[PDB]
Design a protein around this ligand. Structure first.
Ligand SMILES: Cc1cc2nc3c(=O)[nH]c(=O)nc-3n(C[C@H](O)[C@H](O)[C@H](O)COP(=O)(O)OP(=O)(O)OC[C@H]3O[C@@H](n4cnc5c(N)ncnc54)[C@H](O)[C@@H]3O)c2cc1C
Ligand SMILES: Cc1cc2nc3c(=O)[nH]c(=O)nc-3n(C[C@H](O)[C@H](O)[C@H](O)COP(=O)(O)OP(=O)(O)OC[C@H]3O[C@@H](n4cnc5c(N)ncnc54)[C@H](O)[C@@H]3O)c2cc1C
Lengths: 311, 311
């Protein structure tokens, strides 16, 4: 049987694979549903990963992780995992095509992803002024005006944050009400760098071959239109954790999760189930940065190594 | 005053400085007691930092971190900090020569240090076959022989860990009995790849250009000098956390610590003191890897940014 099954090949899974294998686990298998590297791969540039000084596309950034993380004997399975279950004191991995794999320990490194909006120009201008990460990209817009789209905590919090960097922030929402914490909303209503554009819809993201120049918006109260000139547009429209592999046949969850579906872990990346670990954007309080995910992967692998030593 | 004072310029403080400064903190100051990079600087070879494909000394590995982490406005003070104290709603940073600095927030990123033995050859060979890190260096002696010095749980755990990677592990201790949990001693004694050398004392560590090649050892009962040929020597003789900066005039500690001196934090690198955060080997459950310290720094800076918005 597999000693350790790593589900997901982003930074968390790749680091887990590096560490497990370098730590003497002889049969570690990384499961990836096609295209190693994870979310960063959609980025046109990453510059805040500590210790890598060259600014380069997410795909180029991740590509040396392939030969390094596989250098010490890691194996691959190219397949979408459907489900992980507990069986006696081990685990069963069910592949979506119906094949099965058993493993002594499992690391869930399945991450998540930002909801998209499907507004016209979103895909065309993505990385040229359309963004999903204020931490990653907010600094490029240092003395400028920027727009934020969204209704919950992340949207309002990110508008406060960008208001600290940018000359001005338009906060665009379809409703006068925000599905977020009321005190954070009060801070934003009392921050003079944030103009609220409510109730609005973004009808098109417009610009030229260098990226965004403006948004076509409509007030749904009056239907008056407006062309809003901004180099930067941040969308914070919800996040989906890739939970699905946790769901059992009787619809129960494999391990304890928080009320948003993230997996509960302690500082050693352990879940409440013995021999099951989690790492990356999938776990509670994940800061959602590559270094963070990589760190989790390393610490989960170290935990696996101790676990296999004792069982 | 200073927005954020970062105490320590190892991977933790470096990445905290990167993130804080890229996240819009206009006056972030890094305090370093002379020569950033931290502990890895003493190693002749690092290979397990995810995303960095070339194997390279610690000095060379850390060089690009200086350029990158200082690229966004980060300031420094080259001074040994003697104390951090709380005063009103801010912090007072007392330098060892009596200079004082005030800051709104503080990140403790002071790391730790293994205890050294002083066995002739310990400096000459430090990070060149003499190691304090089984995780970091074990894989180099993959199918090779190795010695471990120490009597606690950690010498004993690390010798079991190494026995799963190396052909043979010599476990050297100054007496016949051990300070570790009885159960873990049991496990060692049934580990056929682990050879106890007890009551022994290592008399000399010898090598050449490529590093450690042998140790001069001596049976303390018998007085026979063995010469032990091995290319790798691990030393687990204790660890100290760089706590000192936390001790107040009254002898109390600024913030909550565990039994060993490590600073208590939550998942967002928050201590129990408002405005005070910690990152790296200084904190509870730190794995003691560069990627982990760097992740704690990023997330401590992220918490600093939210704190400075609120306050
Ligand atoms: C557009 C964009 C830009 C970003 N820019 C930066 C940046 O500049 N700096 C930074 O630090 N971070 C950035 N991030 C955030 C960063 O990408 C994530 O924090 C990081 O990738 C999380 O790593 P992970 O390993 O936990 O998950 P992921 O990267 O999400 O990867 C999980 C992997 O598992 C695979 N998987 C999922 N489910 C299954 C399954 N059922 N079976 C088999 N495989 C499965 C997926 O295909 C995926 O490859 C950016 C993110 C995005 C989306
Ligand atoms: C021999 C060895 C080999 C290692 N190999 C690896 C490896 O291969 N891979 C890996 O990932 N990790 C490795 N590590 C562990 C890694 O180096 C540490 O985990 C990492 O450096 C911890 O980072 P840090 O920022 O918390 O602290 P440190 O690296 O210890 O940095 C703390 C910094 O704070 C400064 N400081 C302390 N006190 C004060 C003060 N009073 N005032 C001002 N400045 C102060 C120190 O001078 C130091 O620069 C190794 C460690 C050792 C000892």
């Amino acid at each position: 049987m597999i000693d350790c099954a790593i589900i997901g090949g982003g930074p968390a899974g790749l680091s887990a694979g590096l560490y497990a294998t370098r730590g003497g686990v002889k049969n570690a298998v990384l499961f990836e549903k096609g295209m190693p590297g994870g979310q960063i791969t959609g980025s046109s540039e990453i510059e805040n990963y500590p210790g890598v000084k060259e600014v380069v596309s997410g795909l180029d950034f991740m590509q040396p992780w392939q030969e390094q993380c596989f250098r010490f004997g890691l194996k691959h399975e190219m397949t979408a995992v459907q489900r992980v279950s507990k069986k006696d004191s081990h685990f069963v991995i069910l592949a979506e095509d119906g094949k099965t794999f058993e493993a002594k320990s499992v690391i869930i490194a399945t991450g998540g992803s930002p909801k998209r909006t499907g507004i016209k120009g979103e895909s065309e201008y993505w990385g040229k002024g359309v963004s999903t990460c204020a931490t990653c990209d907010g600094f490029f817009y240092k003395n400028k005006e920027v727009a934020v789209l969204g209704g919950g905590d992340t949207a309002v919090e990110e508008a406060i944050y960008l208001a600290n960097i940018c000359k001005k922030v338009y906060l665009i929402h379809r409703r006068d009400g925000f599905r977020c914490a009321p005190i954070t909303l009060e801070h934003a209503k009392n921050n003079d760098k944030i103009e609220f554009l409510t109730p609005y819809v973004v009808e098109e993201i417009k610009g030229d071959a260098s990226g965004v120049s403006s948004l076509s918006i409509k007030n749904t109260a009056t239907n008056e239109k407006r062309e809003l000139v901004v180099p930067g547009f941040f969308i914070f429209v919800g996040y989906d954790v890739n939970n699905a592999v946790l769901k059992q046949e009787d619809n129960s969850m494999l391990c304890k999760c928080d009320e948003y579906g993230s997996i509960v872990v302690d500082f050693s990346m352990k879940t409440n189930v013995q021999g099951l670990f989690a790492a990356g954007d999938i776990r509670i309080f994940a800061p959602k940065q590559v270094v963070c995910a990589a760190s989790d992967g390393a610490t989960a692998a170290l935990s696996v190594i101790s676990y296999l030593e004792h069982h």
